[PDB]
Design a protein around this ligand. Structure first.
Ligand SMILES: Cc1ncc(COP(=O)(O)O)c(CNC2=C(C(=O)O)C[C@H](C(=O)O)C2)c1O
Ligand SMILES: Cc1ncc(COP(=O)(O)O)c(CNC2=C(C(=O)O)C[C@H](C(=O)O)C2)c1O
Ligand code: FES
Lengths: 461, 461
């Protein structure tokens, strides 16, 4: 169920990982590879590599492993003879769903629907979740402008050759620091790192500032309100400007906490006021919970903290949820089939696993546990921040979704490398931040284990 | 392995399907659903629905099931204890690949690499395959223009805010009638049906005509030559035109047989000459084999019929291949990591299945089987075309990738509906075509089962 602590045999990557990396690098650029893994031996919060190292994994495959490695409840699912068909007969779900499709959706995604959103479409990853949410929003916007009218002859002819009016020049507004995926639509709304964006054609869509809070929060209450207000004003200005340019903003996308761009937080007030700005200008409000969703902030969806009855029009998800997709309000339901569509629309085998994951999260109270273990973690980070101000700053988080900055990227990288060799896997986000993304079976004692290991690391650093 | 023929109990959709379709329609638009399926009872070439109907399936989940339903070799894989981890521990493949990653690629995709393409990146579907192929091509074209110069100050700045020169105004040339996926980059190269395109923002990229062959091929040799030469000229004119527009064509994307757009074929000669045009103007030649790939034309990749040692720069695949991805030439390898990247990059459980699928295709000589079973099907279609000229025209195919036209969409849909009630599932493409996409365990005797059912339908029509 759970190993007792990490156990290191070699530096990481070790000799066997380096050999496999060399082989992989023949067929593709393999420079991003950290090391090669023995998933069969990995269990709970512990990842085992091919050199026999066992590390405490606080990165969880870029936040996508919900209840740990080799979870016994999922092992038993794969072992049931009745589930074999689900793994080897993949349907074109849009046209030929399996008998249990709706019941399995009730056991899983529908049991955790966000407030106000009765509709659900499934997708296989976070990028096609967001792309199809964009499309759903453009279709809804044009519907407001035209319907209940038929498509015009001119629209139908021009859309086949990539021309207006069939292909409108509408826009989605996004934020600096955002990350929403890397397919060409998503990528236009992504503003994380130059290397993600460069040499790829884009869209002239509006880009607003996301707030940069000053820390510690109790000392900058007024400065941070002013910063949030200034950003809200620029959002509203942009929407007016792009309407004048004939590039109407049909929707606004935002993450509840910006991840890849550097764990940027903002107050619940900011998001509430942003939701209002959205409604006020007839913009669909798209909340991207691909990384924040699934419980690590202490609530199943992070937008739940805003306490709104109408938090959004569309919400996308993936990663911990195993499958992707988006919930949406009834009024965003496409008016005809084959507009939001692709071959597979997810995968029933992922829904099979997700239903059991959701069952475990509920039965074992793991939302509460993330709040609790996350408070232990953050408390400890604040203490190390106090004791090592020359290395640690802007300690921040919600639930286990925590982070801090280091003075620069070289130190960030050195700390992550040292930590890994000591048995703890950490992720970097932004320039010089270190981020935590523990699985949902991360408990108090894992937090205390990390803190005691990292404390020793700082003392020797 | 397989039943002996279809066995119908009810109209399709029957009462239990119509009840499930009503439930699903509460949570999403379910108007595209044909019926609900019992995949556990489905076997080989036969799909069984929830009302107990057993249909000969000649659509195979939109040409994505490679060796039929519930194949016993695939059943065995899921039953093996050693494989449980591959199904429940999904890795972030770009950073933390499993120990067997490279070896399982040697057992599967690399054992069928196209000529001249040493590189391989995996993706989870056809859309992100084509999206990342576009990006790979744009990065390559820019590298041609700048290398050995590094990224300029201005580029690194402008790319973060969606502007040139960081974000170039390059284009991908695509063909009328094409289908390449529905994410916003793919969608700009798709020109299949207005319903796919309407109300979605697009890119101003060049669109060339795809040859429309006249049948019988034997009576139109000169005209078909001239038609292809006309299209080739128009492609080359578009590349020149768009270079002047300062919207340089970085690549050309084409299907070896256009599927969704209406099963449009062209000669092998046309494709060789198109490949040469691409090279001549320094465009990458991107061949989309998401639907034609995996054996049904008699060769593993449909471009293999062209007989070239250098058939393309990049080739994408998905559907029958279980996983997506693209092969490409070494000169197209990304210079830096994190440019072509996403969380999952495919799924090792699909590679596990695909290695076994490829083993079966080889051991059971299924490429040659598809050429033979396809010839028998096409011979029978030609006979029906001679006997029923009021309903059947332009019979055409390669391997089991066959199709014919009916007089109008209304008749097409009625014939599909009648055939389904008589035990055979067919697909449509374009305005008024009926298409065949049988699985690779479709045999000459299944061709005759279909032909005899369809002959009775046509006599009573
Ligand atoms: C908020 C959010 N929205 C969309 C996505 C895209 O998901 P997917 O990687 O396409 O399945 C993601 C994926 N997250 C990734 C990174 C961050 O952190 C890094 C990875 C990358 O593509 O570089 C993917 C996301 O976090
Ligand atoms: C040649 C070709 N190129 C890309 C794709 C996209 O694949 P995917 O649906 O995103 O996995 C596809 C998928 N084909 C589809 C249809 C045709 O036929 C119908 C389905 C649709 O999106 O309507 C998908 C394809 O056939
Ligand atoms: S774009 Fe989501 S799986 Fe391909």
């Amino acid at each position: 169920f759970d190993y007792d602590g990490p156990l290191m045999k070699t530096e990481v990557p070790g000799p066997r990982s380096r050999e496999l990396m060399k082989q992989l690098n023949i067929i593709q650029n393999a420079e991003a590879v950290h090391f090669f893994c023995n998933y069969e031996e990995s269990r709970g919060n512990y990842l085992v590599d091919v050199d026999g190292n066992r590390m405490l994994d606080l990165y969880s495959q870029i936040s996508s492993i919900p209840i740990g490695y080799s979870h016994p409840a999922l092992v038993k699912l794969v072992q049931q003879p009745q589930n074999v068909s689900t793994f080897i007969n993949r349907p074109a779900l849009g046209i030929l769903p399996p008998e249990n499709f709706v019941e399995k959706l009730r056991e899983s995604l529908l049991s955790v629907a966000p407030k106000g959103m009765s509709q659900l479409i499934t997708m296989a990853c976070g990028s096609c979740s967001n792309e199809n949410a964009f499309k759903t929003i453009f279709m809804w916007y044009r519907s407001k402008e035209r319907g209940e009218s038929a498509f015009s002859k001119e629209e139908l002819e021009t859309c086949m050759i990539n021309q207006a009016p069939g292909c409108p020049d509408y826009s989605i507004l996004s934020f600096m620091g955002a990350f929403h995926g890397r397919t060409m639509g998503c990528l236009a709304t992504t503003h994380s790192k130059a290397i993600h964006k460069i040499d790829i054609p884009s869209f002239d869509w509006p880009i607003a500032p996301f707030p940069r809070l000053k820390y510690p929060l109790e000392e900058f209450v007024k400065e941070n309100q002013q910063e949030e207000a200034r950003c809200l004003e620029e959002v509203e200005d942009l929407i007016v400007k792009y309407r004048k340019k004939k590039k109407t903003v049909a929707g606004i996308i935002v993450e509840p906490i910006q991840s890849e761009g550097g764990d940027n937080h903002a107050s619940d007030d900011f998001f509430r006021k942003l939701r209002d700005i959205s409604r006020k200008h007839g913009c669909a409000f798209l909340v991207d919970e691909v990384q924040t969703g699934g419980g690590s902030t202490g609530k199943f969806w992070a937008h739940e903290h805003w306490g709104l009855d109408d938090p959004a029009d569309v919400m996308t998800f993936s990663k911990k949820m195993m499958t992707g997709g988006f919930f949406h309000k009834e009024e965003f339901r496409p008016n005809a089939p084959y507009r939001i569509f692709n071959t597979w629309l997810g995968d029933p085998s992922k829904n099979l696993l997700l239903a059991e994951v959701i069952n475990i999260i509920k039965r074992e109270d793991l939302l509460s546990n993330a709040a609790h273990a996350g408070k232990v973690l953050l408390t400890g980070l604040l203490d190390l921040q106090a004791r090592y101000p020359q290395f640690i700053s802007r300690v921040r988080g919600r639930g286990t979704f925590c982070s801090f900055d280091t003075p620069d990227e070289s130190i960030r990288n050195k700390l992550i490398s040292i930590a890994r060799n000591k048995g703890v896997m950490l992720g970097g986000c932004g320039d010089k931040s270190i981020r935590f993304r523990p699985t949902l079976v991360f408990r108090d004692h894992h937090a205390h284990l990390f803190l005691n290991i990292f404390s020793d690391i700082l003392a020797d650093f």
